[PDB]
Each structure stands twice: as structure tokens, then as C-alpha cells.
Amino acid sequence: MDHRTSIAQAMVDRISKQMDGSQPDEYFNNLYGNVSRQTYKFEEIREFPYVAVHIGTETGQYLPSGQQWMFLELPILVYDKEKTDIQEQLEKLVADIKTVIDTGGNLEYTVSKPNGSTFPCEATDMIITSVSTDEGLLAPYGLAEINVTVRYQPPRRSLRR
Amino acid sequence: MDHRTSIAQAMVDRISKQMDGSQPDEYFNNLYGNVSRQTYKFEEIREFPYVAVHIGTETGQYLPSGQQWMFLELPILVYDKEKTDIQEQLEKLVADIKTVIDTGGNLEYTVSKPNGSTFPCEATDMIITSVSTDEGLLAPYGLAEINVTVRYQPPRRSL
Amino acid sequence: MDHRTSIAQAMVDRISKQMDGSQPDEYFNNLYGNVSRQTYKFEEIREFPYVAVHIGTETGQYLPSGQQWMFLELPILVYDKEKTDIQEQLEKLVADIKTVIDTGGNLEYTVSKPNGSTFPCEATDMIITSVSTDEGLLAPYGLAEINVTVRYQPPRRSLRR
Amino acid sequence: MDHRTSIAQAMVDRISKQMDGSQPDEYFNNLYGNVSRQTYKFEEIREFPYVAVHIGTETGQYLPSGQQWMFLELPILVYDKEKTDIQEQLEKLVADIKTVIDTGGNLEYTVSKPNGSTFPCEATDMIITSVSTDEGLLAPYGLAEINVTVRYQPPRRSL
Amino acid sequence: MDHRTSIAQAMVDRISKQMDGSQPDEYFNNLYGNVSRQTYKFEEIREFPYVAVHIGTETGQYLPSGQQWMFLELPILVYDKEKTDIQEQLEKLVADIKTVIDTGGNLEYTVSKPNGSTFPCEATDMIITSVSTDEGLLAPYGLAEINVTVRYQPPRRSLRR
Amino acid sequence: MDHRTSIAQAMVDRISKQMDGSQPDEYFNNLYGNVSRQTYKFEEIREFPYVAVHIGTETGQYLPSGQQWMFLELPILVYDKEKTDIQEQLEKLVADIKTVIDTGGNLEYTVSKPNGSTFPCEATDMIITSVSTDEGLLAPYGLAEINVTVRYQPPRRSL
């Protein structure tokens, strides 16, 4: 069950593939290559136009058929040095992230079975909750927080002991 | 979608063009020219009669046709020095700003399409939430908080 | 709209005029002249039997006819030195304040039309909320916190562009 | 209206008169004389068996005939030293106070009209809420909180 | 009314008599003699396997027949000192306390009428709420908090002035 | 009643026995030996495939036949020490722990009667609530919080 790290990896891979070096229309920040989940915080992060994917808490409920409903959360932060205008650039980055989340397809999985092979699976639904930004201080830099939720269905490894 | 800073720019342009040096009746602050969002806080801003717009969190809901609804928030701050009575000037500014927000039409809007041109759009509705007031301390200056919410439809639909 | 400072000025004028030098019956503080809103805090205020009104937050709701309902709140404090006793004399003050607020008529307005003349208006209702009291410390002095709410109808400057 | 200080004074007079040197049955603290509201806190109060009555926030509601309903609050504090047990003496004082509040009639009242005479009145009903006490520290003395509510009708009506 | 320390003393006497030096089945701590309410806190308490009962707040509601329903709370604490295992011994003691409270009879009373004699009474019900356990720190010692509630009927000393 | 420490022993024994050096399929942590409750905190624990089980507050309700219902809470913490990804190893551990909690039967139980013998019993149902994750700081190590609830009936009835 869980699949949390696999979900994060699929998310960052989807952002990278669908955002980089293609389709000037629709999506436009042209991240050459960057986005990841292993390296974050602030210190380090020597480049700009970088966006980070965090890991958050989850919630769970039990349905009376062995099916599992699991709610998962992913905080997303965006950084941009100045260029034209902190507000404009942060809003443009968050808009591109949002459209990549929404308009194209369902989320994909690359789970690894116990000491076996990878069996791809899908993700039921995706919802983007409130998205906030930083304040005036730390003037030349800027932040953009994104709160997104994922609802996956774990494999029913029940009723099969 | 998103489309926040353009909401801010549209509101700033509307307040600036609607308040400046025209219509002596109805509107009474006569800002020569001023209102912006790039520069705020308190430091700098060497004039008074200065009103500022902030940008804050917005929340969204998913209607079952691919349609989007998003409620956005803007804090408004007003400063004034003392020509006569600080409370009177503050309420004067707040009344004028509320009038300009409410009475005239929907907001004009200036989206910027990917690597293309600007296609004008609208803003659904305007709502004025609580109006706070500053305190006695920092005597010669004064503040007047305004809470306003915006609800726009983002010009895009899901699969 | 608003009319907030006009409301405060009208209420303080009502208190001062209706409370001073007249009607020994039903009213007993006989304030020579004092009640105001511009000067408060504690420092200054060299006299006593002084009473001050503050300015507080407001709340607004929109009715589907262009009519506006705005709730306005006014915190009022009373300062009084000694004499007979702090408790009874402060409560005598606040009892006079309550009776002058409730008993006699609705409010009056002296609002200002944009670059024009003053057109008087009325205020719908007054409701008096909790009335707190100070504590033992600062012994020779005492406070009396009284909170009042005002429900006015702003001029319908809508449907007329 | 308001009238709360006279409510407190009447309650103090009632406890003093009903508790002192009379009726060995029912009431057992035999307070010779003490109970007041002018002097409290802890400092001073050199004797013991003292009990104090405070003054607190009140709330009001408007019925549609000009009638007024106002709920009031009185914190009550009891102190005891150590003849035998601090807990026992505290509960004995608390039980006697609750009995005197509950069993006997409505409260008497002594309003003073504006520059006139004293016209006695009544008090509608008595309600006593949670009863808490002190902790281990400050060992030789003891405390016992009493929370009571008062609901009076103000002898006046609106327009 | 009240009768609070009557409840506390009856409870502690019940624990003592029903728990000490008898019935090696069912009840298993063999507290030789100890349990009390006057002495607590931590400092002092030189023995061990000691249990202390506190006094807490109460709550009261009024029924329209002169009957009073009063809720009273009693926090209970236990202390133990190594021997086998802290967790085991603490839950050993708390299981004994819980079964003594629950399985055997209703509470008794030794209340005192004004300057008279003792007329025993009863207590309607007992409920035992959440039971917390202490943490690793202060290693050789350990706590296990018990929160119980009682619901007695105060004597209807109303309608009889 | 109560019975918490034996619940903890049953949980630790079950995880240890279902976890060690058997069934390469399904279960992939191969913990040689670790899980316990006597030693925890962080200090000590010089190995870091370790998993710890805590003890928490429980709540009870009274059904009207003398039957008792008790909901118990168990915080579970997992540590790990690199070798590839901290996040990946933590999620693998959490998935394996959730699997072992859910898939196999009700919990076995080993109550000890007063000065008697051990009579095995059962545990009604297992529920796993929210699962938290650690933070960036303290980089080379990792945390993985698990919160589970236990609902056992006490093998005794009231009068």
C-alpha cells in the first residue's frame, strides 16, 4: 500500500517531461531540467526557476468491501529570482504548474512489487487546494506555495491472506 | 487559470483612472497619481494619501462540468497625514474606495495568453468584507484596513 | 457609504447635550462638558467623570435588492477617580450611559454629501452588549468597559451609476 | 438599569445576616462578621474564615415588548486556615454558602432612584455553576471558587 | 449539599479495605496500608506502590422538581518503583483499581448533618474515563493517570425552608 | 480490564515473528531483530532498521448489558539510515508494516490472570489512521510516524 514516494516521483517526472523544451504554447517557462524531490529547503538550490515537491501527512478511511480510500497531500514551493517582476513571475510559474496538473490526463504510477517487477497503475482524482505566496521581505527572492491533494486506491491486499 | 497579479493590476488601473482629478461630485479624494502594489510596507512612500493593495490566499472548488470557481482575497491599506482630523480623512478615503468598488460595472481584465496577445475578459462579482480601523499609537499617521474578495472564472476547462 | 465617524460624532454630541446641566431626574452625573472622541488613551484627560468612545471593526452583508446591512461596533470606556466608592459611582455613570442610549429616540445623522451640504438621516437600531469592569489594581482609579452595536442602512448608491 | 453593585451588596448583606450567630442547625460556620466586597485580593484580610464576592461581566437580550433580560456573574472566593482539614473546612463553607443561596427565597434589593428614595425590589432566580478549588501549593491556606449567576429585570422599559 | 470529601474518603476507604491483605484471587497488589488523600504531590511519599486521589471541579444542572444532578471528578495517580517492569507494574495496579471501582457495589457515604449525627447515603453511578500513562523520563519511576466521574443526588434541602 | 501492556507485547511479537527472515515475497524489510517497547526515544538504538511501539491514552464507553468497549491508541515510529533514499526506505517500511497489520487475522493475546495461568484471547479489530512523515533537518536519519487504534473487550462484566 501507501505508494507515496512513487506518487511523488511520478508527479515530478510528469512536470519535468510535460514542461521542458516543448510546446511553447499553453505551457511557457521552459524549465531546461531541474525539478526534483530529493534536494530542497533553500540552502543549496544554486539555480533558479526551481520548483520543489514536498511530502505531507495523509488520512485514511475504511469502506466495507476491503477497498481502501487514502487521502494524500503534497506541498509545492516555487522560487524565482527577479527578472521582470517577482509577483508576475511567481504567478506565471504557479499557473503553469496548475495547468500541467489539471488539463492533461490522469496521474501514473511506477510501483515496485515485493522483490518483483513494476506493474503500472492509475490514480483516481487530483484536486488543487489554496495556493499562497510569500511577502515583501527577502526582496530579490520570492516563494509560491501550492497545496495539492491526491486520492489513490491501494491494491486490495485483503481477502487474500 | 490562477491569474492573480492581473487582477491586482486591473484593480489598480481602475482605482487610479476612476479617482484622479475628475468628477468632483461623488468622488472626493483627488489623488493626483499614486496607487500601486509594487512598493508598500510603510518604509519608502514619502507622500501620504497613499493606498495600497496586497495579494493573498485564494480557494477553489470543482463544479462537475469542468467549470472552475475560485474566490480570491485582497487586503487594502490606507494611510493619511493630518490635514484636519485623521478619523475623518480615513473614513473619507474608505467611503470613496467602497463607492468606486461597488457602483461601477464589473472589472476589466487583461489576460496574457502564452506567447500571444492580450484578450480582454471580465470579473464576475465584487464583495466587501469587514472594514477595520487603526489605533491611537503612531499618532500623526493612521491606517484603514479593507477586506475585499474576488471570484473570477478562469478561461479554461478540464478534460 | 460608511458614515462611521459621523455616527461617532452624532452619538457623542447626543450624550453631551442630553446629559449636561438639565433633567436632574432620571439622569445623575451632571457632566459640565467633556465627552469626546478625539482625545483618549489615559495620558492627557486631566479631569475626571470623563467618558470616551472608541472606533471598532464592522461587518457587512449584501441583500439582493441593492440594500446594504452593515453592523458597526463602538467600545466605550469610563474613567473616574474616587469619592464615595469606585464601584458604585462607576456603575452610576454606566447606568446613566445605558439609559441615555436606550430610552430616548433613534439616532441623528449629519453626513456630508460629496462637495455639497448636510442631509440628515437616521440609524435603524441600537443593541447594547456585555458591560465589563476593571480590577482592583490601579486602586484610586477604575474603568468601565461597555460595548455597543449600531445597525445603519448605507445610502443605496447602487442602481444609479 | 445595570444595578449590579446593589445586587452584590444585597447578597453580601444576606450572607452576613443569615450566617452570623444564629440557627446552630442548618448553617455551621458561625461567621461573627466579615463578608464584604470592598476589600479583597489576598493581601490584607488578616483573619480567616473570610469569603469574598467579586463583580464580573454581564450579558443582555431584548424581548419584543420593551422588556429587558440581563444575566450576571459573581465569582466567589473562600479562604480557610487549618483547624483540622483544609479540604473539609473549604467544603463546609461552600456547602453553607450554597444552602443560603438556594433554600431561602428570592434576593432582597435596595435600588436608589436618581436623587430620590430607596424603593425595594426583587431578583428573579438564582443559578450556581461549577465549583472549583485550589491546589496543593500554598499549603496552610485554602481556596474554593464559587461561580453563580444572577438574572434581574431592570425596572425600566424602552419606548 | 456538596458531600465531596465524603466521596473521597469513602472511595479511599473502599480501596483500602477491599484491596488489602485479602482475596488473593481477583485483586493482586496487596497494599499493606497506605492509600490516602491528605498527603500527595511527589515530595514525601517515601514508600511505594502508593496511590493518591485528588479533588477536581464539579458541574451542576437543575431539574424542575427540586432535584439536583451534580457531576464530580476525581483524578487518581499511582507511583511505582522498578521491580520487573515499569509498564507492567503500572498497568497491574491500574487494572486492580479499575476492577475494584467497577465490579463491587455502589459507593457509600459517611456525610455529616449540621451539628448532629452521620446518616449514610448512596451515590447513583460511577464512570471511569480515559486512563493516561507517563513517559520515559524520570526512568525508575512512572505514573498512570486515572480520571473517574461520579453522579450523586444532593439532599433535596429545598421546598423545606 | 485495562490490559494495555499485553496488547503491546502481542503487537511486538506479531511484527517480529511475521517480519524476520521468512517469506521473501510480500514482506521486504528482513528485520533480523529489533521491534520492542522497553528501549526507545532515539538515544541508544545504535542500529537503525529499528521500529518502536509506544503506549498512549485510551477511551471507554459503557453499553447497557455490563459489556465494556475500550479504544486504545498506539504511536509507532520507524528510523532508517540511508543506503539509497531515506524517503524510499521509510515508505517501504511503512507499507510493509501496514500490510502486516491489516492482512493477517486478528491479534493473538496472552493475558495473565490474577496469580494464575495465561488464557489466550483475541482482539476485535484493527484500524490505522493518519501516517505522518519526517522533516528535512537531521538529514542522514529519518522518521516515519504510524498511528493505530485498538478496540478490545475486557474479559469481565459488571454487576
Side-chain angles (χ1 to χ4, degrees):
Chain A
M1 290 75 99
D2 291 331
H3 295 88
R4 157 209 302 174
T5 296
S6 296
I7 296 168
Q9 168 82 99
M11 171 76 38
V12 65
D13 209 341
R14 169 166 160 172
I15 297 296
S16 159
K17 171 185 176 47
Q18 184 177 182
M19 182 145 288
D20 63 358
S22 297
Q23 277 165 306
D25 317 336
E26 195 149 289
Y27 319 135
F28 63 98
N29 290 318
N30 189 358
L31 295 168
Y32 298 163
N34 191 0
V35 308
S36 49
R37 73 186 185 278
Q38 195 46 38
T39 51
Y40 43 100
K41 281 183 321 176
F42 194 58
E43 292 179 353
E44 296 155 18
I45 289 284
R46 333 204 74 94
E47 29 183 337
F48 273 114
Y50 184 103
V51 65
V53 174
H54 283 284
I55 300 309
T57 61
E58 64 85 16
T59 318
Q61 65 184 6
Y62 274 11
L63 278 194
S65 66
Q67 293 179 356
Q68 303 214 70
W69 274 125
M70 295 299 291
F71 303 88
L72 185 139
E73 279 190 9
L74 300 166
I76 299 169
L77 301 163
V78 190
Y79 302 76
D80 247 339
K81 209 173 177 293
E82 311 196 35
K83 199 92 66 184
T84 310
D85 268 330
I86 307 97
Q87 300 290 324
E88 271 66 71
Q89 217 179 0
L90 277 296
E91 181 285 345
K92 296 312 279 313
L93 264 292
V94 64
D96 293 18
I97 297 169
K98 178 177 277 185
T99 186
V100 176
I101 299 299
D102 291 331
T103 188
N106 277 342
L107 185 47
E108 289 290 60
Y109 290 166
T110 311
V111 67
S112 175
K113 276 205 72 163
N115 296 115
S117 65
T118 80
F119 293 99
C121 201
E122 301 216 300
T124 296
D125 198 346
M126 293 177 70
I127 297 184
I128 184 164
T129 51
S130 68
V131 298
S132 176
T133 57
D134 202 82
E135 273 311 324
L137 277 296
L138 279 152
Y141 304 84
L143 183 63
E145 199 164 59
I146 297 162
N147 288 318
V148 70
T149 51
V150 191
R151 292 172 71 190
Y152 59 80
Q153 193 145 310
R156 302 183 281 167
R157 203 144 76 206
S158 187
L159 305 172
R160 172 207 169 278
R161 284 91 181 191
Chain B
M1 311 85 78
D2 263 347
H3 278 184
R4 285 150 60 269
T5 61
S6 295
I7 298 296
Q9 207 65 60
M11 181 145 198
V12 162
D13 186 74
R14 168 167 160 171
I15 190 64
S16 160
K17 204 152 41 193
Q18 187 94 10
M19 212 186 258
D20 55 348
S22 179
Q23 303 106 321
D25 291 331
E26 290 180 351
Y27 305 165
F28 44 86
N29 290 319
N30 189 359
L31 289 156
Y32 275 10
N34 215 307
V35 185
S36 83
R37 54 151 201 280
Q38 298 253 9
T39 64
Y40 63 91
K41 281 177 319 178
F42 199 56
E43 293 179 353
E44 285 87 6
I45 302 299
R46 303 203 86 113
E47 28 196 351
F48 281 108
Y50 181 64
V51 65
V53 63
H54 282 285
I55 294 297
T57 79
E58 69 276 16
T59 316
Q61 62 164 310
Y62 273 9
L63 289 192
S65 180
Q67 299 168 350
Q68 295 297 109
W69 268 118
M70 282 216 171
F71 315 91
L72 190 143
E73 302 195 30
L74 319 171
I76 302 299
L77 293 171
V78 189
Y79 300 160
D80 271 308
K81 220 185 173 186
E82 210 192 12
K83 273 72 180 178
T84 355
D85 250 351
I86 190 167
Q87 291 278 18
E88 289 182 353
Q89 262 167 36
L90 289 161
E91 62 86 20
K92 205 83 161 283
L93 265 289
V94 176
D96 183 288
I97 296 169
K98 170 172 271 196
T99 300
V100 65
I101 297 169
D102 203 318
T103 188
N106 306 346
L107 274 69
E108 192 87 330
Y109 196 59
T110 311
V111 307
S112 62
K113 206 82 91 183
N115 313 331
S117 49
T118 61
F119 274 70
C121 285
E122 261 186 10
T124 294
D125 186 74
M126 281 325 317
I127 297 169
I128 300 299
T129 312
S130 72
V131 175
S132 175
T133 296
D134 206 47
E135 311 287 30
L137 294 174
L138 203 63
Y141 303 160
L143 181 141
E145 201 146 350
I146 301 297
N147 264 353
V148 57
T149 49
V150 192
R151 53 179 296 161
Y152 53 72
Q153 184 186 326
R156 198 65 168 273
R157 291 158 80 259
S158 306
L159 190 68
Chain C
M1 291 75 98
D2 291 331
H3 300 192
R4 180 219 281 149
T5 297
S6 297
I7 291 171
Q9 169 80 99
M11 183 177 177
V12 65
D13 211 331
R14 169 166 162 172
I15 301 299
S16 161
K17 174 282 161 183
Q18 193 283 0
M19 191 165 248
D20 63 358
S22 296
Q23 280 159 314
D25 291 331
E26 294 178 353
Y27 308 140
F28 55 98
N29 290 318
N30 184 265
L31 295 176
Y32 299 159
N34 189 179
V35 189
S36 46
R37 92 202 178 260
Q38 193 42 37
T39 51
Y40 44 100
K41 282 185 322 177
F42 195 58
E43 291 96 50
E44 298 154 19
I45 298 89
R46 334 202 74 95
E47 25 175 346
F48 267 126
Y50 190 110
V51 60
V53 302
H54 285 285
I55 296 298
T57 181
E58 67 89 19
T59 300
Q61 63 174 10
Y62 280 5
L63 278 194
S65 66
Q67 293 164 350
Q68 313 214 50
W69 276 125
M70 311 216 88
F71 305 89
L72 177 140
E73 184 176 0
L74 299 167
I76 308 183
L77 310 155
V78 189
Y79 300 70
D80 203 341
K81 224 181 177 289
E82 231 263 320
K83 295 195 59 175
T84 330
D85 276 324
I86 300 96
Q87 301 291 323
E88 290 81 3
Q89 193 203 30
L90 276 296
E91 320 197 5
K92 294 171 73 70
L93 265 293
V94 76
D96 291 331
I97 297 169
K98 181 172 278 185
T99 188
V100 65
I101 297 169
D102 291 331
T103 301
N106 280 342
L107 294 174
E108 281 315 91
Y109 278 163
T110 49
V111 302
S112 179
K113 189 174 181 180
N115 296 115
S117 65
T118 63
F119 292 166
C121 182
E122 301 216 310
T124 295
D125 204 308
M126 321 205 87
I127 298 184
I128 206 174
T129 50
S130 72
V131 176
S132 176
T133 316
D134 210 53
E135 282 300 6
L137 277 296
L138 291 183
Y141 306 99
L143 294 174
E145 205 176 39
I146 173 169
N147 265 337
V148 70
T149 51
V150 181
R151 292 174 70 192
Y152 64 91
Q153 194 145 300
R156 303 184 281 167
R157 214 148 81 190
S158 187
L159 298 95
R160 167 211 171 288
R161 286 93 181 182
Chain D
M1 301 75 88
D2 291 331
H3 284 185
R4 64 221 180 100
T5 193
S6 293
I7 301 298
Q9 166 81 98
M11 196 175 197
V12 163
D13 189 358
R14 168 165 159 171
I15 189 65
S16 66
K17 174 152 41 193
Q18 186 95 350
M19 197 155 260
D20 56 348
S22 178
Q23 281 158 314
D25 291 331
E26 289 181 351
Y27 305 155
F28 41 88
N29 290 318
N30 189 359
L31 295 165
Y32 301 159
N34 196 0
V35 187
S36 48
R37 45 141 161 91
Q38 303 274 140
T39 52
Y40 63 91
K41 280 179 319 178
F42 194 57
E43 321 166 70
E44 310 321 314
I45 298 89
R46 301 183 71 86
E47 19 158 346
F48 281 117
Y50 200 28
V51 64
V53 173
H54 284 283
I55 292 296
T57 307
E58 63 269 357
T59 305
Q61 65 165 109
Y62 281 4
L63 261 63
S65 180
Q67 297 170 350
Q68 274 193 331
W69 268 120
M70 293 180 183
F71 313 90
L72 193 147
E73 273 174 50
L74 300 202
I76 279 178
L77 289 167
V78 188
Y79 301 164
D80 275 325
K81 222 187 173 186
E82 209 190 4
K83 277 75 186 175
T84 10
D85 293 288
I86 298 91
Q87 295 282 349
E88 289 181 354
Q89 281 174 198
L90 289 163
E91 66 182 1
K92 295 272 281 283
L93 266 294
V94 164
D96 281 324
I97 295 170
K98 170 169 275 198
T99 301
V100 65
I101 297 169
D102 213 348
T103 188
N106 315 326
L107 273 69
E108 191 66 340
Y109 187 71
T110 312
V111 70
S112 64
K113 274 263 171 63
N115 295 1
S117 50
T118 61
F119 264 100
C121 285
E122 71 186 310
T124 295
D125 188 75
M126 281 295 78
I127 298 144
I128 183 165
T129 51
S130 71
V131 175
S132 175
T133 60
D134 63 358
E135 313 295 4
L137 294 174
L138 202 73
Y141 302 170
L143 188 151
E145 288 187 354
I146 300 281
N147 263 353
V148 298
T149 49
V150 178
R151 60 179 294 164
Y152 62 74
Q153 183 185 325
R156 198 65 168 273
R157 292 158 81 260
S158 306
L159 190 68
Chain E
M1 290 75 98
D2 291 331
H3 298 192
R4 155 212 298 172
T5 200
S6 297
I7 287 170
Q9 173 83 99
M11 161 76 68
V12 74
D13 211 325
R14 169 167 161 172
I15 299 298
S16 160
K17 168 183 176 48
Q18 164 64 120
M19 171 155 268
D20 62 358
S22 296
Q23 279 159 315
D25 291 331
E26 293 179 354
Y27 306 156
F28 57 93
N29 290 318
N30 189 359
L31 282 145
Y32 278 30
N34 189 179
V35 309
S36 49
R37 74 191 198 271
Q38 195 46 38
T39 51
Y40 63 91
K41 281 183 322 176
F42 195 59
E43 65 183 1
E44 297 155 19
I45 299 284
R46 333 201 74 95
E47 15 182 352
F48 258 136
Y50 188 108
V51 63
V53 301
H54 285 286
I55 293 298
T57 70
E58 66 88 19
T59 301
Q61 66 186 24
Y62 274 10
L63 281 193
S65 83
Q67 294 165 350
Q68 313 203 39
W69 266 119
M70 185 180 288
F71 307 89
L72 188 153
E73 283 213 29
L74 298 165
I76 295 182
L77 294 174
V78 294
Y79 302 72
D80 255 338
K81 210 254 187 190
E82 230 314 300
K83 193 149 39 205
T84 319
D85 277 324
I86 304 97
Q87 303 291 325
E88 280 76 340
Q89 203 154 30
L90 276 296
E91 321 186 17
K92 286 302 296 309
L93 265 292
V94 69
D96 283 28
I97 297 169
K98 181 173 278 186
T99 184
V100 176
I101 297 169
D102 291 331
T103 192
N106 280 341
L107 191 43
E108 290 295 70
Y109 267 121
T110 303
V111 302
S112 179
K113 261 203 83 162
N115 296 115
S117 65
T118 63
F119 292 166
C121 192
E122 301 215 300
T124 296
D125 206 306
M126 301 205 168
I127 298 184
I128 184 165
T129 51
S130 67
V131 175
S132 175
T133 289
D134 186 74
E135 281 305 9
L137 277 296
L138 301 177
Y141 303 96
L143 294 174
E145 206 173 39
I146 296 162
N147 288 319
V148 301
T149 50
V150 292
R151 292 170 70 192
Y152 56 93
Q153 203 146 8
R156 303 184 282 167
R157 214 158 91 201
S158 178
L159 305 171
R160 166 211 180 280
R161 285 85 190 201
Chain F
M1 291 85 98
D2 263 348
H3 281 188
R4 312 187 275 91
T5 194
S6 312
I7 296 312
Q9 202 70 34
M11 187 66 204
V12 161
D13 189 358
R14 169 165 162 170
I15 184 64
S16 161
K17 185 183 287 185
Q18 295 297 109
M19 182 154 257
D20 57 345
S22 178
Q23 280 158 313
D25 270 317
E26 289 180 351
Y27 292 164
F28 45 96
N29 289 318
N30 189 358
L31 293 184
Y32 274 12
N34 290 318
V35 287
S36 47
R37 67 185 184 273
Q38 304 254 340
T39 290
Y40 63 91
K41 281 178 319 178
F42 187 48
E43 320 167 80
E44 286 88 5
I45 301 299
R46 334 198 71 92
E47 59 185 358
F48 298 103
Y50 199 80
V51 176
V53 174
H54 284 283
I55 293 295
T57 304
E58 63 282 18
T59 300
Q61 61 166 118
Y62 274 12
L63 288 193
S65 180
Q67 297 170 351
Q68 263 194 350
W69 269 119
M70 292 275 188
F71 312 91
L72 193 146
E73 302 195 30
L74 294 174
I76 276 171
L77 290 166
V78 185
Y79 302 164
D80 276 305
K81 212 216 158 186
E82 272 276 16
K83 276 158 267 195
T84 11
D85 297 18
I86 302 94
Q87 293 282 349
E88 201 155 30
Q89 291 195 219
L90 291 162
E91 62 86 20
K92 293 175 73 69
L93 266 291
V94 172
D96 173 278
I97 292 172
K98 169 172 270 200
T99 302
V100 65
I101 297 169
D102 186 74
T103 187
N106 317 317
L107 273 69
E108 182 87 339
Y109 186 69
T110 185
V111 69
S112 64
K113 282 254 170 63
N115 296 115
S117 47
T118 61
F119 279 54
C121 284
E122 45 172 354
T124 299
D125 186 74
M126 281 295 78
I127 297 169
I128 196 173
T129 183
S130 71
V131 175
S132 177
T133 302
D134 62 356
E135 301 286 35
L137 294 174
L138 201 43
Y141 293 9
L143 191 84
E145 192 145 330
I146 305 296
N147 264 351
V148 298
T149 49
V150 190
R151 57 179 295 163
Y152 63 90
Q153 183 185 326
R156 198 67 167 274
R157 292 157 81 260
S158 306
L159 190 68

